[PDB]
Amino acid sequence: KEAAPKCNNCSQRGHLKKDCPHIICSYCGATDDHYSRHCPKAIQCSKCDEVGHYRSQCPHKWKKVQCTLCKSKKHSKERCPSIWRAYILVDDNEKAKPKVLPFHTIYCYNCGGKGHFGDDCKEK
Numbered sequence: 001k002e003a004a005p006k007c008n009n010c011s012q013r014g015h016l017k018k019d020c021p022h023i024i025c026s027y028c029g030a031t032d033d034h035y036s037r038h039c040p041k042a043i044q045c046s047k048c049d050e051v052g053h054y055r056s057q058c059p060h061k062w063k064k065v066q067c068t069l070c071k072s073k074k075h076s077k078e079r080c081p082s083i084w085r086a087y088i089l090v091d092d093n094e095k096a097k098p099k100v101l102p103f104h105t106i107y108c109y110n111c112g113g114k115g116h117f118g119d120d121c122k123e124k
């Protein structure tokens, strides 16, 4: 903060002597730098006071990544297969044995099941 003047008359707001005649937002900035292209680059970083605290001038805090190797901004477990709790693209269930099937039994109770030529394909 370090303000010698603090205000021209009102004694309670961020607009010092030469700041008070200008339409400067109540704690954003100084009229020496604060402008319609420079509003976020002035005295304070956010809703909390000054750029003058915390490393990287108090950056915005994202909700972090769901993965623990990946750290920054991107994706979720359904978009990142590269974690051992996700499913693999191998050894999944599929069809087998693409060949013709065996023949059926029909052999008149004399040489298998029941069916053919029983009039003469008989001995006893």
Ligand SMILES: [Zn+2]
Pocket: 007, 008, 009, 010, 011, 013, 015, 020
């Ligand atoms: Zn004032």
Ligand SMILES: [Zn+2]
Pocket: 024, 025, 028, 029, 039, 040
């Ligand atoms: Zn502003």
Ligand SMILES: [Zn+2]
Pocket: 045, 046, 048, 049, 050, 053, 058
């Ligand atoms: Zn801050």
Ligand SMILES: [Zn+2]
Pocket: 067, 068, 070, 075, 080, 082
């Ligand atoms: Zn990941």
Ligand SMILES: [Zn+2]
Pocket: 107, 108, 110, 111, 116, 121
């Ligand atoms: Zn037979």
